[PDB]
Coordinates of C-alpha atoms and ligand atoms in Angstrom, one line a residue:
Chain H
X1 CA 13.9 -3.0 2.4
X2 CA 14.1 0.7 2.2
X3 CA 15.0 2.5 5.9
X4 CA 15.8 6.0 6.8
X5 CA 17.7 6.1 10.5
X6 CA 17.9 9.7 12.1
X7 CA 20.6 10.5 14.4
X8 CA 22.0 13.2 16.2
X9 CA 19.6 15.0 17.9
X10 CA 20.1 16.5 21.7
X11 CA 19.6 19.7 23.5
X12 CA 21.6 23.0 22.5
X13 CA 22.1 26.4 23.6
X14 CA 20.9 29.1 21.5
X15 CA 23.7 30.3 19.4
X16 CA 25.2 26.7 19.2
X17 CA 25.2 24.4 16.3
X18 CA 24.7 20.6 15.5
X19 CA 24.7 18.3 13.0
X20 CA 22.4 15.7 12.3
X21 CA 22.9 12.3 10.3
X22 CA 20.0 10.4 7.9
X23 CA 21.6 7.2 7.6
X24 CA 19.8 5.7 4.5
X25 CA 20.5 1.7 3.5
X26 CA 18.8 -0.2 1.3
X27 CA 18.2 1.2 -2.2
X28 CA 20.7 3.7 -5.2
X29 CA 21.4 6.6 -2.9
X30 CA 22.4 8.5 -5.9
X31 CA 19.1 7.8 -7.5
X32 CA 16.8 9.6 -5.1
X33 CA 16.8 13.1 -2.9
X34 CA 17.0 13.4 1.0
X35 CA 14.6 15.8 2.5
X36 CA 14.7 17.4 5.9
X37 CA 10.8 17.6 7.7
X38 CA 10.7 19.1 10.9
X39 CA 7.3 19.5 13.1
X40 CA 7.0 21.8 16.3
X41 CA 5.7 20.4 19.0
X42 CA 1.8 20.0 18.3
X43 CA 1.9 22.2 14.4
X44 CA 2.3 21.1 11.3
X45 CA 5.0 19.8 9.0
X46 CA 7.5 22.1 7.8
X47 CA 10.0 21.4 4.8
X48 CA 13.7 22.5 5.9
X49 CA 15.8 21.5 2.7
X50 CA 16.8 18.8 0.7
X51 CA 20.1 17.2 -1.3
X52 CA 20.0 15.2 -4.6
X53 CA 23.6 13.3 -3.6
X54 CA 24.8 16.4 -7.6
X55 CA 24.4 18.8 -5.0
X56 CA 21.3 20.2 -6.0
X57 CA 20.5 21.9 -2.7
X58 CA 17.6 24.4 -1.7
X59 CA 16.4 25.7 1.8
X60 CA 13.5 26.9 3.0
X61 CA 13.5 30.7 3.8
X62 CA 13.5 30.7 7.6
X63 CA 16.3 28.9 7.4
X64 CA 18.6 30.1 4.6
X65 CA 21.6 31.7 6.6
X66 CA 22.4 29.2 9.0
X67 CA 21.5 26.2 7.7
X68 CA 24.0 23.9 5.6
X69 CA 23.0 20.2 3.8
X70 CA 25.5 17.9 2.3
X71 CA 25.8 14.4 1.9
X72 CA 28.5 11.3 1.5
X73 CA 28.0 9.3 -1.5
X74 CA 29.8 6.5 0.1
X75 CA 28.1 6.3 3.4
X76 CA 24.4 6.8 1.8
X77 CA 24.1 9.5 4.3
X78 CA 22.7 12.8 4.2
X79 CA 24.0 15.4 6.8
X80 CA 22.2 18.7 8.0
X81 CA 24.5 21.4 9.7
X82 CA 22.5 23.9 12.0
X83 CA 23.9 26.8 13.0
X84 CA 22.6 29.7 14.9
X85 CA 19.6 27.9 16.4
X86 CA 17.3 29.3 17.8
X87 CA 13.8 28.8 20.4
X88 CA 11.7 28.8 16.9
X89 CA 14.1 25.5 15.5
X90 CA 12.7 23.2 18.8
X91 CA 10.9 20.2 16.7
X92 CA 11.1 17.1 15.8
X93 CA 13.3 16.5 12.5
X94 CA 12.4 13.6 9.7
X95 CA 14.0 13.1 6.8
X96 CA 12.4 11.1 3.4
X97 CA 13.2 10.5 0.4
X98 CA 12.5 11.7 -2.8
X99 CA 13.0 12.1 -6.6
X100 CA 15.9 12.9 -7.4
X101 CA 15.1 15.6 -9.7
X102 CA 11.6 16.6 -8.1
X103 CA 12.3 20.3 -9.1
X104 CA 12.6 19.4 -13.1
X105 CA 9.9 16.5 -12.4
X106 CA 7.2 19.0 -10.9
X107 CA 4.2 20.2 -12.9
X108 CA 1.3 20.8 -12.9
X109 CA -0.1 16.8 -13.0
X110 CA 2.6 15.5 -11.3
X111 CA 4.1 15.4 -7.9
X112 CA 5.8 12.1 -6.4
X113 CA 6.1 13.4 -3.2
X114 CA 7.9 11.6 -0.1
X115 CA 7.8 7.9 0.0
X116 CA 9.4 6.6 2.7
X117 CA 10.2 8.8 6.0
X118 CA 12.3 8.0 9.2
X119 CA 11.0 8.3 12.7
X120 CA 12.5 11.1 12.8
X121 CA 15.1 12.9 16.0
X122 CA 14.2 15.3 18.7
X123 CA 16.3 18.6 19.1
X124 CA 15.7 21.2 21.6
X125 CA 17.2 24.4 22.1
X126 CA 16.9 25.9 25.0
X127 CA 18.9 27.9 27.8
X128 CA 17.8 26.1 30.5
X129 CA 19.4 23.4 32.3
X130 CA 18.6 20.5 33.3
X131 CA 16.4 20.1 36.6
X132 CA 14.2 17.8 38.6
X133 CA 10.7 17.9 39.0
X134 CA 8.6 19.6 42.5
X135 CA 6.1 16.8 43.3
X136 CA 2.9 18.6 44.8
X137 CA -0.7 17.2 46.0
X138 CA -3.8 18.5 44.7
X139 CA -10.8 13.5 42.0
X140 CA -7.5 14.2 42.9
X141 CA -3.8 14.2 41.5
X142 CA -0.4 15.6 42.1
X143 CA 0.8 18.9 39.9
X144 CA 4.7 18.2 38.5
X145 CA 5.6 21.3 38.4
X146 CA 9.0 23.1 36.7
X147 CA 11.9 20.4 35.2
X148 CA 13.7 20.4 31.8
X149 CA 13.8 18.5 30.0
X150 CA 10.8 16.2 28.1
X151 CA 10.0 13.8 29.1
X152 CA 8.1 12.2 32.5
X153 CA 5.8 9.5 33.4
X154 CA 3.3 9.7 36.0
X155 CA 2.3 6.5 37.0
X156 CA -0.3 5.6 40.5
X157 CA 0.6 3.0 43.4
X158 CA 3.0 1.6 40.5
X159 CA 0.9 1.1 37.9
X160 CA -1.9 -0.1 39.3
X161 CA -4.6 3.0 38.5
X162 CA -4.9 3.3 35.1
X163 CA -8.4 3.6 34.2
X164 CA -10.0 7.0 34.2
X165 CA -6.5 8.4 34.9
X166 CA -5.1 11.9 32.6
X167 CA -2.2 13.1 32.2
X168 CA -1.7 16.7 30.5
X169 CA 0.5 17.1 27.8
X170 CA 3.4 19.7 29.5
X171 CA 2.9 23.5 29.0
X172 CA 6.6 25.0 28.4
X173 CA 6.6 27.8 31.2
X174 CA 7.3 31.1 30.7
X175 CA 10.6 30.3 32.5
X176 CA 11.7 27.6 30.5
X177 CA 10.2 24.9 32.6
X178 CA 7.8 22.4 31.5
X179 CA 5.2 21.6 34.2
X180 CA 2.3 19.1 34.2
X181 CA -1.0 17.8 36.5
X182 CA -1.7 14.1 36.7
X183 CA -5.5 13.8 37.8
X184 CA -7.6 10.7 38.7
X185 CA -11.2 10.2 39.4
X186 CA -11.7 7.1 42.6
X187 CA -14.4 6.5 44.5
X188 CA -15.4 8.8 47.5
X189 CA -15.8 6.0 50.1
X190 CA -12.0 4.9 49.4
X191 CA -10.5 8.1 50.6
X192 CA -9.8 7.4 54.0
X193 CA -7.2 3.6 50.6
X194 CA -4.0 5.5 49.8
X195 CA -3.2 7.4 46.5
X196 CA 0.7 7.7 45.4
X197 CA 1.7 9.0 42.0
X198 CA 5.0 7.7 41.0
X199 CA 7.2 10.4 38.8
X200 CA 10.1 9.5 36.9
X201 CA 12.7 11.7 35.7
X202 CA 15.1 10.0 33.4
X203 CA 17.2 12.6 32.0
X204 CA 18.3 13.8 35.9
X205 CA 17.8 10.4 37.8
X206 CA 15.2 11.6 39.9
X207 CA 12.2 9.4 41.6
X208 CA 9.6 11.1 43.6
X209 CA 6.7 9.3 45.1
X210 CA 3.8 11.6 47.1
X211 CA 1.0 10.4 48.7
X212 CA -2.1 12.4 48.3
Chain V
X1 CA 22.8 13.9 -22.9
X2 CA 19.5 12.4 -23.0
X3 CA 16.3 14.4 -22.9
X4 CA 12.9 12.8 -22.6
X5 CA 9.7 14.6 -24.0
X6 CA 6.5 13.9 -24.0
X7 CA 4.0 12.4 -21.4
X8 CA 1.5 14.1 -19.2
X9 CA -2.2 13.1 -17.6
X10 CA -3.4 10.6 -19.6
X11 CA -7.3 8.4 -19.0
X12 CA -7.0 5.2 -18.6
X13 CA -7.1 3.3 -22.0
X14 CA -5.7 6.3 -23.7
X15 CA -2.1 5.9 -25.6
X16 CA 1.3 8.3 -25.4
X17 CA 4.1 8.6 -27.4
X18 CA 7.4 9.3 -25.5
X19 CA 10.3 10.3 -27.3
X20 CA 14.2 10.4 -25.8
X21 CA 16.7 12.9 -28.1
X22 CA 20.1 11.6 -27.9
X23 CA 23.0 14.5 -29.1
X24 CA 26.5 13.7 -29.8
X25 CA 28.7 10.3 -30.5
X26 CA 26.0 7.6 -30.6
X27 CA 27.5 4.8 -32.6
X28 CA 29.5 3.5 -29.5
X29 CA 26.1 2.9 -27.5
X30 CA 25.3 -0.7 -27.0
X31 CA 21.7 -0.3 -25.7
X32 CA 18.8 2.1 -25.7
X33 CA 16.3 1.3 -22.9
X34 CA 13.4 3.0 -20.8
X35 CA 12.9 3.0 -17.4
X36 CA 10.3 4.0 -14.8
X37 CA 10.1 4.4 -11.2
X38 CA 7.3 4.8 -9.2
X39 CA 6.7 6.5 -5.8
X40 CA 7.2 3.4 -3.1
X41 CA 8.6 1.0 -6.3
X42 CA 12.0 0.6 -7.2
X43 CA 13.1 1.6 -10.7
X44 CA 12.2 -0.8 -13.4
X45 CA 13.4 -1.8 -17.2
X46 CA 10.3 -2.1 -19.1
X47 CA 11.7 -2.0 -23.0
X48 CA 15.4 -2.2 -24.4
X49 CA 16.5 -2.1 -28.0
X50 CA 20.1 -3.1 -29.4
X51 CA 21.4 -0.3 -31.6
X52 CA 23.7 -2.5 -33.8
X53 CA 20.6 -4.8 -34.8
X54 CA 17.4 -3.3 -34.1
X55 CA 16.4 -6.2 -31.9
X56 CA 14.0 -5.1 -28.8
X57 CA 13.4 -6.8 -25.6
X58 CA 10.4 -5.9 -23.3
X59 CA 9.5 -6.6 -19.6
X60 CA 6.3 -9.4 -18.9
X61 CA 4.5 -6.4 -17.2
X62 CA 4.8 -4.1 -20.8
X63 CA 4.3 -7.1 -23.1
X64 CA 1.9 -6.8 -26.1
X65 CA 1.2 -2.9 -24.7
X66 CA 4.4 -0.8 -25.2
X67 CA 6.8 -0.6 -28.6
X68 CA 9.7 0.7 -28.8
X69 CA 11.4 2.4 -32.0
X70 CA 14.6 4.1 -33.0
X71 CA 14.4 6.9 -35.8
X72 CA 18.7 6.8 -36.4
X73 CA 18.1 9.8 -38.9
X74 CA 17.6 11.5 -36.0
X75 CA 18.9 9.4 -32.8
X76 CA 15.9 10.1 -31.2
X77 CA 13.6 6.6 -29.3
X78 CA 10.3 6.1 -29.3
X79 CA 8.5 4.2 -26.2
X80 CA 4.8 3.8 -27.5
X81 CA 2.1 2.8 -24.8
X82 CA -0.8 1.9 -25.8
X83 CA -4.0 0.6 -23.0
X84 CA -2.8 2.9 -20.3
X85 CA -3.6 1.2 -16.3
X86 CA -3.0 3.3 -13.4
X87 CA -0.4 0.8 -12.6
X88 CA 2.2 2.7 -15.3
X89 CA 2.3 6.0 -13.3
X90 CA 5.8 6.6 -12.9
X91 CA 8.3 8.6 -14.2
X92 CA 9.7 6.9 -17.6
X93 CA 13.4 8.0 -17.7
X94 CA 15.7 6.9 -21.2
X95 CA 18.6 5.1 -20.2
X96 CA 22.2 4.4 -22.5
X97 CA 24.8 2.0 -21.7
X98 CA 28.3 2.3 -24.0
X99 CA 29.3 -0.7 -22.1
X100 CA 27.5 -4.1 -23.5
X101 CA 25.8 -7.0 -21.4
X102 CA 24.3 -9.8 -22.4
X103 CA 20.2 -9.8 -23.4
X104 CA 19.5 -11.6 -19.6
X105 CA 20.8 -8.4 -17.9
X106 CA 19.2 -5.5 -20.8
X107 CA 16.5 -5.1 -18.7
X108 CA 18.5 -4.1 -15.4
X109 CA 19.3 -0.5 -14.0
X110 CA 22.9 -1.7 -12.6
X111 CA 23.9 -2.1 -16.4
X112 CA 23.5 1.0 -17.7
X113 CA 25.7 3.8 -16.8
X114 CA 23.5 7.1 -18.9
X115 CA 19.9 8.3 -17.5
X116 CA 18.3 11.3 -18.7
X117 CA 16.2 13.5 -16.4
X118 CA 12.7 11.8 -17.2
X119 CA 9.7 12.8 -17.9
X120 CA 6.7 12.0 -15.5
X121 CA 3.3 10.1 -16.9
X122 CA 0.2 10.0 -14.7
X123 CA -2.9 7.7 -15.2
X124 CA -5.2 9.8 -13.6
X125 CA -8.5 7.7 -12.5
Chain J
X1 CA 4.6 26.5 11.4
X2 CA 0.3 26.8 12.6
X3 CA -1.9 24.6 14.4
X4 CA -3.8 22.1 11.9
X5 CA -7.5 22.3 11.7
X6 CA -10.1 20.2 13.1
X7 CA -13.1 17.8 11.5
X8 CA -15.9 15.8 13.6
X9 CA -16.7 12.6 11.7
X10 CA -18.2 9.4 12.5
X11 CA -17.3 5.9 11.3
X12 CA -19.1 5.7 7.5
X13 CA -18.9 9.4 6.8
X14 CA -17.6 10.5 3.4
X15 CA -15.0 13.1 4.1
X16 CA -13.8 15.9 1.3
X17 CA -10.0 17.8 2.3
X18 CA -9.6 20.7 0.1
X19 CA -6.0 21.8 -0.2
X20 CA -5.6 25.6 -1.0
X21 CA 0.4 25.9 -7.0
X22 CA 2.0 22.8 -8.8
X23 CA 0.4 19.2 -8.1
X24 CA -0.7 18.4 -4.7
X25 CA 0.5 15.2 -2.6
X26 CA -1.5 13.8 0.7
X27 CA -0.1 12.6 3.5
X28 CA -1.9 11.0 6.5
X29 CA -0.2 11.3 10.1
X30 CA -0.7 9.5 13.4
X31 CA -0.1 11.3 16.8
X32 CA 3.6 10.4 17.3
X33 CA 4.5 8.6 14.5
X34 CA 6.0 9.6 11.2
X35 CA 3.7 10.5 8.6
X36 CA 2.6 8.5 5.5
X37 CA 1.9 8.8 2.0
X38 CA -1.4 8.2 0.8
X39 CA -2.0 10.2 -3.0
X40 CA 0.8 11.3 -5.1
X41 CA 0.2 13.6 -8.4
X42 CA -3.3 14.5 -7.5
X43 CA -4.9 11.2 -8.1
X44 CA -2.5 8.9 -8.2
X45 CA -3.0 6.3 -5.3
X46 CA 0.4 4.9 -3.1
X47 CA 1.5 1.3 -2.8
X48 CA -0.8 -0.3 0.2
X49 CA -3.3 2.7 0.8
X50 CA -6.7 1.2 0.6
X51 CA -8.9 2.1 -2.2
X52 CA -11.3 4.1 -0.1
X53 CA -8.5 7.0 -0.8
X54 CA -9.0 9.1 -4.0
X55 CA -7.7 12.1 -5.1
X56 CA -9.1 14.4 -7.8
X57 CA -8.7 18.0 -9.2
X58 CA -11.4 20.5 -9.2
X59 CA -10.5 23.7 -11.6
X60 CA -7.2 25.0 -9.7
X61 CA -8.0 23.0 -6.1
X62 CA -6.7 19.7 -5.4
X63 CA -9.5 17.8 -2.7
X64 CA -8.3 14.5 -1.1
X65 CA -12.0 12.3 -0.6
X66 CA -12.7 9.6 1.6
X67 CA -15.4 7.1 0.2
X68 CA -16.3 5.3 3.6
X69 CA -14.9 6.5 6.6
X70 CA -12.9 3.9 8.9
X71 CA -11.7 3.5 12.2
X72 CA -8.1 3.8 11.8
X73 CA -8.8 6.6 9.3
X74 CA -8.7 9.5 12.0
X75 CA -5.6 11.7 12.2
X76 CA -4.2 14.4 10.8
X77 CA -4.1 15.1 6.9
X78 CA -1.1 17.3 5.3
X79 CA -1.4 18.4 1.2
X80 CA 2.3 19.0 -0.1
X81 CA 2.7 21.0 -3.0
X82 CA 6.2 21.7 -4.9
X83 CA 7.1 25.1 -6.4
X84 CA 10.0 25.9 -8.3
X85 CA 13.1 25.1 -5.4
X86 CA 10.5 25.0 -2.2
X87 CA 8.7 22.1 -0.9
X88 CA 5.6 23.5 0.9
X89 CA 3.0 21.2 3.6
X90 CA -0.5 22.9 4.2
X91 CA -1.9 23.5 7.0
X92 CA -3.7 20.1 7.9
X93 CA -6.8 18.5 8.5
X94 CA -7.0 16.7 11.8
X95 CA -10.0 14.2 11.7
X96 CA -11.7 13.3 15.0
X97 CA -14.9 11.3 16.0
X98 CA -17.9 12.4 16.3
X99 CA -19.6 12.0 19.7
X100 CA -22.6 13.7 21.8
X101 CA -22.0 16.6 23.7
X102 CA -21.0 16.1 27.2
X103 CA -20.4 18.2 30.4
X104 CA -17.3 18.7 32.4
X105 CA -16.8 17.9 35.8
X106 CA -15.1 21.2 37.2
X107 CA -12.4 20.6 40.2
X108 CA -10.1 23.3 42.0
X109 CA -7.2 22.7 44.0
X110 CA -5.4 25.1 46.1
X111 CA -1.9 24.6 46.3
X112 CA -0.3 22.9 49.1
X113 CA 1.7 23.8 52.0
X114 CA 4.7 21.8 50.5
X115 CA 4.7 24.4 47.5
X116 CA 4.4 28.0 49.7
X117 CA 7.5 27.5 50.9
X118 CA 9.3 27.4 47.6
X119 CA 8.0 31.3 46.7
X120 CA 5.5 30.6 43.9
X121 CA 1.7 29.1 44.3
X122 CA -0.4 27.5 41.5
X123 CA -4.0 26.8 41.2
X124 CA -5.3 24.3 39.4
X125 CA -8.8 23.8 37.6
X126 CA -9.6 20.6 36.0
X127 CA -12.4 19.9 33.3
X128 CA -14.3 14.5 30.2
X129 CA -16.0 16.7 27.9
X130 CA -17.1 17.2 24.0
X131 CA -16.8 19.3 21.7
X132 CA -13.1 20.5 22.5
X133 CA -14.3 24.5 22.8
X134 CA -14.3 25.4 26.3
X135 CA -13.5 28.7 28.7
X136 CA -12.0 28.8 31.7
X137 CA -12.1 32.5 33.7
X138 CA -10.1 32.8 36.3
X139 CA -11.5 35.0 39.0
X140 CA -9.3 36.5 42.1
X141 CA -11.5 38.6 44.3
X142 CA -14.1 38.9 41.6
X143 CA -11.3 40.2 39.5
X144 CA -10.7 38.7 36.1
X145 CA -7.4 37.8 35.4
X146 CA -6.1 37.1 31.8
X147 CA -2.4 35.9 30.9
X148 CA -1.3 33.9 33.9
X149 CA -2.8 31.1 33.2
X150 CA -1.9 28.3 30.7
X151 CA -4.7 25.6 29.3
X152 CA -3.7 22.0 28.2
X153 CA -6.0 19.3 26.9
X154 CA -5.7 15.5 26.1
X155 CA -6.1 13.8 23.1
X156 CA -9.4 12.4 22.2
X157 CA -9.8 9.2 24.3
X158 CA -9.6 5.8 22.6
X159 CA -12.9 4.5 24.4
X160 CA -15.3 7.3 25.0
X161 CA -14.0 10.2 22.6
X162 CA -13.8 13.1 25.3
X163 CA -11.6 15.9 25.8
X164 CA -10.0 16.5 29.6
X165 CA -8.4 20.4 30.0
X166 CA -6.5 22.1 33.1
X167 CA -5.7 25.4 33.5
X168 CA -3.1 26.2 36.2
X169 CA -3.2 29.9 37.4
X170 CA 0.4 31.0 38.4
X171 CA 1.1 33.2 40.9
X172 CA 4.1 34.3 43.8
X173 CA 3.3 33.8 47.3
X174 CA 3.4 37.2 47.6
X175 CA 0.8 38.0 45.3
X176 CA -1.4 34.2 46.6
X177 CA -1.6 35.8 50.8
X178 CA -3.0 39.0 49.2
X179 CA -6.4 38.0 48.5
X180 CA -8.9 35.2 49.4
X181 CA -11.5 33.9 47.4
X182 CA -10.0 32.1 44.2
X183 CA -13.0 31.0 41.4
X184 CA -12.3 29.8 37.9
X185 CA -15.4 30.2 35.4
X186 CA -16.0 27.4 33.0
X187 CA -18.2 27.8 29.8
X188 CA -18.9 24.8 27.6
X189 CA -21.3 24.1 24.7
X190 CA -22.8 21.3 27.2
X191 CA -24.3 23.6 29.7
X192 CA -26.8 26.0 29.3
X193 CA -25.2 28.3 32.0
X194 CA -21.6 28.5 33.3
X195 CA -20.5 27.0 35.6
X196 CA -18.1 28.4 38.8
X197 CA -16.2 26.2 41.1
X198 CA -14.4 27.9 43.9
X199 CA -12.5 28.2 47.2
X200 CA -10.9 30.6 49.8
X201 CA -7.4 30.5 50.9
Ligands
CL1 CL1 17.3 1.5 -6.5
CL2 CL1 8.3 15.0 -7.8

């Protein structure tokens, strides 16, 4: 039925610019408004701007100067031009659709809201470039410390340890590095059994495996 | 063009009165019909009414519930809705079509060419 | 742009979100998944949201209510309100299970040789545990250290609801060959005193 495809989304310099596409299909494009929702990672939901085909247009004030929405009528997609990015624009960026005069529509006992929303596209800015991980041994684990960008799997002896096994979320370094531990809990008798943790880094082709 | 008035947060069982004012060269329009959309739904014909006979022609979902009127002393349509469900919460918009269709397709939103803005009902449980 | 707000429940709970000015609309969202509609003008329910879901006005608030609470009904809830050109989303309610408290099991691990050669060192000090509120002191020499360190913790586990943290103390090789005993202080609701795992170089 009604689907919302997001496209576009990469990594950028700070100070560059990209544009991103919400290729809509399967409903009256002119009879609706596309909104832009973007989310930092691990806050909340953050409206950007929005396009009623029209081009009733409105941004949100942390991004009034150096952001630009438009549309094509033709291709029922919506386009959002970012310029200037900066560290703060890092998050993930939906788009949904709405009425298509929500502004007149709004009251005070009404509010249709967003009814259908993409899976939205990642877009990082950042200066750094990309780099593979250091693999080092540390229950016990491996620390992967200092590669850009997301993401990695940490997997052990190939899969095969995966109960009791944690993997931290990555903590962006004050460097512009992410960095993560992989721990597991195993039995003290099986210590002198060996322990690998597999890393994969996809965006640098990079395949480390350490035994602990 | 076409403003709708009226509606608001209605109980369920209640009745509301819309009304749609039409301004300018009506005498060319073929049908007068009201629309609603809902949030997930896809925009629906509900009621139309033939200008040049006064015929009206309503949707199975509206039957024996809604009426619709035209007061040509002033152009303005009527959309009465009486025994209220929370299934009619949408936003009832007044649509126009100056080019004519026959009474199978009245009821569809590709055959009319005119909207108005809308105004939104809620049936607040 | 903040960090949504936290809410134990169990399974069967009735759960009340206040939203704090046009109507509000409620959203429910999954970790890593697009968010979904659930009430629209106040108190009007969405297409496929089960009745348990209710939305109502009370004076100038807008509260989102959960009759019965369900197992697939924990994540995070948004209210979106509409002014006259913005769209605002509040701050969120993230929903979690309820579960009894539990201790940590504290680890440290020195950093290996493999890492001294590159210039920089880093400790790390591993915490299963509930409630989420937890602190972790770092402690070089007896002296408490603040700023160089960064905390990370898991989502809450889909068998046994616990939390799992690490905090990784950062430091140049330089700096690591200067002192000796390396101690990181952990504090939890579970334990009646702290606890202090820790090592010399
Ligand atoms: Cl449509
Ligand atoms: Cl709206």
């Amino acid at each position: 039925e009604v689907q919302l495809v997001e496209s576009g989304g990469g990594l950028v310099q700070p100070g560059g610019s990209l544009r991103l596409s919400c290729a809509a299909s399967g409903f009256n494009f002119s009879y609706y408004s596309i909104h832009w929702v973007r989310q930092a990672p691990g806050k909340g939901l953050e409206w950007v701007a929005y396009i009623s085909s029209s081009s009733y247009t409105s941004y949100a004030d942390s991004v009034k100067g150096r952001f630009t929405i438009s549309a094509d009528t033709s291709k029922n997609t919506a386009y959002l031009q970012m310029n200037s990015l900066r560290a703060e624009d890092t998050a993930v960026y939906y788009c949904a659709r709405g009425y298509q005069y929500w502004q007149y529509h709004a009251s005070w006992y009404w509010n249709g809201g967003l009814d259908y929303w993409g899976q939205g596209t990642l877009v990082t800015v950042s200066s750094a470039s990309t780099k593979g991980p250091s693999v080092f041994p540390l229950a016990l684990g491996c620390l992967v410390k200092d590669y850009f960008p997301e993401p990695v799997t940490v997997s052990w002896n190939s899969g095969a340890l995966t109960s009791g096994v944690h993997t931290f979320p990555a903590v962006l370094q004050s460097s512009g590095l992410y960095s993560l531990s992989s721990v597991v809990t195993v039995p003290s008798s099986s210590l002198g059994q060996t322990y690998i943790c597999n890393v994969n880094h996809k965006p640098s082709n990079t395949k480390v495996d350490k035994k602990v | 063009q076409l403003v709708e008035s009226g509606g608001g947060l209605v109980q369920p069982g209640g009745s509301l009165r819309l009304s749609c004012a039409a301004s300018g060269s009506t005498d060319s329009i073929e049908y007068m019909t009201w629309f609603r959309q809902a949030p997930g739904k896809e925009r629906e014909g509900v009621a139309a009414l033939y200008t040049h006979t006064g015929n009206t022609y309503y949707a199975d979902s509206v039957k024996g519930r809604f009426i619709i009127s035209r007061d040509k002393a002033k152009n303005m349509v009527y959309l009465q809705m009486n025994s209220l469900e929370p299934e009619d919460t949408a936003v009832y918009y007044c649509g126009a079509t100056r080019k004519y269709v026959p009474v199978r397709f009245a009821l569809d939103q590709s055959s009319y060419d005119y909207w108005g803005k809308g105004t939104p009902v809620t049936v607040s449980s | 742009t903040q960090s949504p707000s936290s809410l134990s429940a169990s399974v069967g709970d009735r759960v009340t979100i206040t939203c704090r000015s046009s109507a509000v609309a409620w959203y429910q969202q999954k970790p890593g998944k697009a968010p979904k509609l659930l009430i629209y003008s106040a108190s009007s329910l969405y297409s496929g949201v089960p009745s348990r879901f209710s939305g109502s006005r009370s004076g100038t608030d807008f509260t989102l209510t959960i009759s019965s609470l369900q197992p697939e009904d924990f994540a995070t809830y948004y209210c979106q309100q509409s002014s006259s050109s913005l769209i605002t989303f509040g701050q969120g309610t993230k929903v979690e299970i309820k579960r009894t408290v539990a201790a940590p099991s504290v680890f440290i691990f020195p950093p290996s040789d493999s890492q001294l050669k590159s210039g920089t060192a880093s400790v790390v000090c591993l915490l299963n545990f509930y409630p989420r509120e937890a602190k972790v002191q770092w402690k070089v020499d007896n002296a408490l250290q603040s700023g160089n360190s960064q905390e990370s913790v898991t989502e809450q586990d889909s068998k046994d609801s616990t939390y799992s943290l690490s905090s990784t103390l950062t430091l140049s090789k330089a700096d690591y060959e200067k002192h000796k005993v390396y101690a990181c202080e952990v504090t939890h609701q579970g334990l009646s005193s702290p606890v202090t795992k820790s090592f010399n170089r």
